[PDB]
Amino acid sequence: GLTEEQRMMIRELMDAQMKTFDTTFSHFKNFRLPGVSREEAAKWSQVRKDLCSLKVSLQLRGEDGSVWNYKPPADSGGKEIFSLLPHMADMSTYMFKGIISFAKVISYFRDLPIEDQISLLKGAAFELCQLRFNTVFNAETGTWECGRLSYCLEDQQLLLEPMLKFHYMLKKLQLHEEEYVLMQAISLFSPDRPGVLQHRVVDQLQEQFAITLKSYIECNRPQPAHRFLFLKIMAMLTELRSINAQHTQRLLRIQDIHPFATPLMQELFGITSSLTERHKILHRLLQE
Amino acid sequence: GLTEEQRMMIRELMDAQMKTFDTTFSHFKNFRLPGVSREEAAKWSQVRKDLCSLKVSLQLRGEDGSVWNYKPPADSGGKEIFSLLPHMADMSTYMFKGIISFAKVISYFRDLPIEDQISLLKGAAFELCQLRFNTVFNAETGTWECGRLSYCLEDQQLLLEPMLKFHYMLKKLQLHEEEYVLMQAISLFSPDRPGVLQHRVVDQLQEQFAITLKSYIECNRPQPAHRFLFLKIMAMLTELRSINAQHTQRLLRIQDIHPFATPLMQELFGITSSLTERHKILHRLLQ
Ligand SMILES: CC(=O)O[C@H]1CC(=O)OC(C)(C)[C@@H]2CC(=O)[C@]3(C)[C@H](CC[C@@]4(C)[C@H](c5ccoc5)OC(=O)[C@H]5O[C@]543)[C@@]12C
Ligand SMILES: CC(=O)O[C@H]1CC(=O)OC(C)(C)[C@@H]2CC(=O)[C@]3(C)[C@H](CC[C@@]4(C)[C@H](c5ccoc5)OC(=O)[C@H]5O[C@]543)[C@@]12C
């Protein structure tokens, strides 16, 4: 059995997840929709590879049963490849606000100095976003099922995209809600994000989330399908950190030649004195 | 061959058609799109019948190669069934303006008194719209191809709807452009529309268009096998008159419980002193 502190810890994380993850996306509104020669050669070739890996069609089900479907242009060579970027920025921004609320509700996060709160969220927002997205990923259809919104991979050869491989591999672990939310906490409380000052405090917090996860698995996963599950999850978290870094770089290349990121995204990802001045939205959201 | 008069009359109609039928729908813009308790319940049950006979899906192909597609809901029970009415009011209004412009170009129509011009257009506008829609109808895919915009039947049992049976049958006749525009003229110059005063003058003009059509077919098509093509065309026109009456009743019932018609549609369909004063937009458009 788990200890009382471990049971209480899982209860609090799960309560926070339920309060701050709009899994039906009911309150995601007012978003944008696609309308109805030197080193620049190499910059465009890269950004074209970057966006082609991120290629999905979009579905919007009306309350009535009606369905709008958007298929992106099939090409790659001009401003047509950027047509979903405003929408993607709005969705991402909505998800990031839910993750910021997730952190704020957690006692262990609330008590950190506000500058470390900023640094941890800068370091983890994309990671916790993928973890939440994975819970609504349908691996059979290659579709993220977001309430009335659906994102469907265009189309083996897609497993070559580390982002997509992550989602398929994580889904195959068949994790419980408790295990997702402990992955979120472990990634959130990463002691070695840039700018974090209380390394030792955050590190001791992370270690207790990891011990709670390992213990949860031991009490609830007797089957041989789940041998080494704890260590697989920890490896997946290390992979998520690498995919995080590849995205930060990917986003900056796209932003350079085609601005699209929202102000909160620019703050989270470093797009241009002290930590609190340079992140006024994050600072405001944390004081609320 | 045709008489030189007949040849000139066909050329006038072809020129009017060329000037006023935006066959690619390039200038249909700014249209609306479906957003992202006694006798009254008996009115709703009839309007539900009226609307589900008028259900298509909507496709919009962007210039960049992207495609937006809209599927309408199942009837259920509520205002969801009205979701495409604003868009259709915009399509119809666009098509009606092109038909008013069509009529205006034609010497034989221009020479009629303004009140009969109004009456003939009120009587025939919907018919000429369907004749023009037929020319962009793809019978194999059940789709009206309107440039970058398509209306697709969803789906044998749809041949039960007179409107759809009309488009499939007319398409099967494989008419020439010249035969369609003569069909438009014969429908437009119908003497028996409500309010027409110069019945005999209009009847004689219609007969000259019918005679021109009959002779066109005699002279251009391989005599036998097209033996009764003219009469088949005339029977399609009769059927179009009845579809026009059914749709007017349909539109009026829908309008009553869910207003959607544009001002021009209100004038054309009688939706509320002299015929001019009750049709100020039509009057303006004709001068
Ligand atoms: C692979 C991809 O296309 O991802 C698409 C669809 C998809 O296949 O899977 C998931 C769910 C993983 C993926 C999650 C995700 O992270 C978002 C929401 C993303 C859309 C584009 C980006 C990457 C956006 C960006 C960055 C640069 O150009 C756009 O940057 C962001 O921070 C995030 O919005 C995302 C989404 C929906
Ligand atoms: C069967 C149907 O779904 O018809 C659809 C699609 C279709 O399959 O075929 C065509 C293309 C011929 C057909 C032509 C047509 O006439 C319009 C534009 C119509 C939509 C509804 C109506 C009838 C509208 C009305 C009246 C009452 O409620 C709306 O009134 C009007 O005057 C016209 O807009 C029309 C349209 C697009």
Segments of A56-123 assigned E as strands: 56-61, 67-71
Q: What is the DSSP secondary structure assignment for residue A161, as one 8-state letter?
A: S
d(CA B148, CA B167): 21
Contacts of A105 (CB under 8 A, 6+ apart): A15, A16, A19, A20
d(CA B161, CA B164): 5
Contact of A75 with chain B, judged by CB distance below 8 Å, is answered with: yes
Q: What is the DSSP secondary structure assignment for residue A228, as one 8-state letter?
A: T
What are the distances in angstroms from CA A185 to CA A63, A93, A97, A215, B275?
A: 35, 20, 16, 15, 76
Q: If we measure between CA atoms, which residue out of A279, A248, A274 comes closest to residue A118?
A: A279
Q: What end-to-end distance do the CA atoms of chain A give, in Å?
A: 37
Which residues partner with B57 through β-bridges? B152
| Inter-residue contact B16 to B107 (CB < 8 Å) | no
Burial class (CB in 10 A: 0-12, 13-18, 19+), B148: middle
Tokens, residue A158: 């897609």
Segments of B29-111 assigned E as strands: 57-61, 67-71
Strand order in the sheet with B137-138: A137-138, A143-146, A149-153, A56-61, A67-71, B67-71, B57-61, B149-152, B143-146, B137-138
Q: Do A80 and B68 touch (CB under 8 A)?
A: no
d(CA B149, CA B166): 22
Atom 31 in ligand 1: residue holding the nearest Cα = A92
- Sort out which chain A residues have CB atoms less than 8 A from B64's CB and list them: 73, 75, 78-80, 83
Q: Is B67 helix (H, G, I), strand (E, B) or coil?
A: strand
Q: If we measure between CA atoms, which residue out of A206, A150, A145, A212 comes closest to residue A11?
A: A212
Instruction: Give, to the nearest 10 degrees, the angle between helix A280-287 and helix A114-135.
Output: 90
Query: What Rg, from alpha-carbon coordinates, does chain A have?
Result: 20
Tokens, residue B275: 């015929």
Domain count, chain B: 1
What are the distances in angstroms from CA B245 to CA A171, B89, B146, B238?
A: 59, 18, 25, 11
Nearest 5°: the CA angle A6, A7, A12 is 95
| Inter-residue contact A66 to B70 (CB < 8 Å) | yes
Which residues partner with B61 through β-bridges? B67
Q: If we measure between CA atoms, which residue out of A4, A278, A68, A80 comes closest to residue B65?
A: A80
Q: Which residues of B are annotated as a binding site?
A: 92, 130-133, 247
Q: Ligand 2: which atom is nearest the Cα of residue B51?
A: 28
Q: Say yes or no: CB of residue B247 within 6 Å of ligand 2.
A: yes
Q: What is the DSSP secondary structure assignment for residue B71, as one 8-state letter?
A: E
d(CA B169, CA B243): 14
d(CA B81, CA B87): 13
Q: Give the type of residue at B88.
A: M
Q: Which residue has the tokens 């995601």?
A: A28
Which residues partner with B70 through β-bridges? A68, B58
Q: What is the DSSP secondary structure assignment for residue B30, as one 8-state letter?
A: S
Q: Output phi, psi for B176, to 5 deg.
A: -75, 160
| Inter-residue contact B161 to B53 (CB < 8 Å) | yes
Tokens, residue B140: 């194999």
Residues constituting chain B: 287
A272: how many CB neighbours lie within 10 A of its CB? Answer: 4
d(CA B15, CA B181): 10
Q: Which residue has the tokens 């009115």?
A: B43
- In chain A, which residue's Cα lies nearest the Cα of B80? A64
Q: Which residue has the tokens 């890996």?
A: A53
Q: What is the DSSP secondary structure assignment for residue A30, as one 8-state letter?
A: S
Q: Do B62 and A35 touch (CB under 8 A)?
A: yes
What are the distances in angstroms from CA B198 to CA A60, A116, B105, B116, B119?
A: 55, 88, 20, 7, 11
Q: Which residues of A are annotated as a binding site?
A: 92, 130-133, 247
What are the distances in angstroms from CA B148 to CA A110, B24, B64, B144, B145?
A: 54, 8, 11, 11, 8
**Parallel, antiparallel, or unpaired: how do β-strands A137-138 and A67-71 relate?**
unpaired
- Cα diameter, chain A: 65
Method: X-ray
Query: What Rg, from alpha-carbon coordinates, does chain B have?
Result: 20
d(CA B236, CA B170): 7
Domain that holds residue B148: 1-287
Contact of A194 with chain B, judged by CB distance below 8 Å, is answered with: no
Q: Ligand 2: which atom is nearest the Cα of residue B55?
A: 3
Tokens, residue B184: 């438009």
d(CA A122, CA A101): 14
Tokens, residue A111: 């008590």
d(CA A202, CA A244): 20
The reported resolution of this PDB entry, expressed in Å, is 2.1
d(CA B75, CA B11): 47
Which residues partner with B60 through β-bridges? B68, B149
| Inter-residue contact B123 to B27 (CB < 8 Å) | no
Nearest 5°: the CA angle B180, B183, B187 is 145
A215: how many CB neighbours lie within 10 A of its CB? Answer: 17
Tokens, residue A242: 């690498």
Last residue before each gap in chain B (C to N over 2.5 A): 36, 155, 272
Q: Do A69 and B68 touch (CB under 8 A)?
A: yes
Which residues partner with B59 through β-bridges? B69, B150
